[PDB]
Amino acid sequence: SQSQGIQQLLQAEKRAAEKVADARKRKARRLKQAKEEAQMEVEQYRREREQEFQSKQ
Amino acid sequence: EKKEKQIEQQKKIQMSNLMNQARLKVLRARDDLITDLLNEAKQRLSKVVKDTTRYQ
């Protein structure tokens, strides 16, 4: 059963490797999402400031 | 700020034109007062020449 205990541990290692690689992929995804959301926020900010400007004029 | 306040500066520009023209308006009114006085003086001299001995 030595070979099997080893294989089971290797499977655990494999999963660990997968879990962090997938986390890094998510990180990349989250960063792109951050940029798009940021721009969307910028657009809302812009609309508000546009309104303030027109109000002031 | 540059541009909405640029419009604000145009309004300041607007205030400059209003104040400068207002100054001319009151100055012109004062010049009419002088002109009207001179015209009245001419009428009073007309009254003088209507005399005989004083005009002679």
Automatic annotation (TrEMBL), chain A:
Taxonomically, the superkingdom here is: Eukaryota
Compartment(s) where it occurs, according to its Swiss-Prot or TrEMBL record: Endomembrane system
Where is the sequence biased in composition, kind Basic and acidic residues?
Answer: 33-53
Q: Which family does it belong to?
A: Belongs to the V-ATPase G subunit family.
- Protein purpose: Subunit of the V1 complex of vacuolar(H+)-ATPase (V-ATPase), a multisubunit enzyme composed of a peripheral complex (V1) that hydrolyzes ATP and a membrane integral complex (V0) that translocates protons. V-ATPase is responsible for acidifying and maintaining the pH of intracellular compartments and in some cell types, is targeted to the plasma membrane, where it is responsible for acidifying the extracellular environment.
* Subunit: V-ATPase is a heteromultimeric enzyme made up of two complexes: the ATP-hydrolytic V1 complex and the proton translocation V0 complex. The V1 complex consists of three catalytic AB heterodimers that form a heterohexamer, three peripheral stalks each consisting of EG heterodimers, one central rotor including subunits D and F, and the regulatory subunits C and H. The proton translocation complex V0 consists of the proton transport subunit a, a ring of proteolipid subunits c9c'', rotary subunit d, subunits e and f, and the accessory subunits ATP6AP1/Ac45 and ATP6AP2/PRR.
Recorded protein name is V-type proton ATPase subunit G
The portion of the full protein included here is 3 to 59 of 118
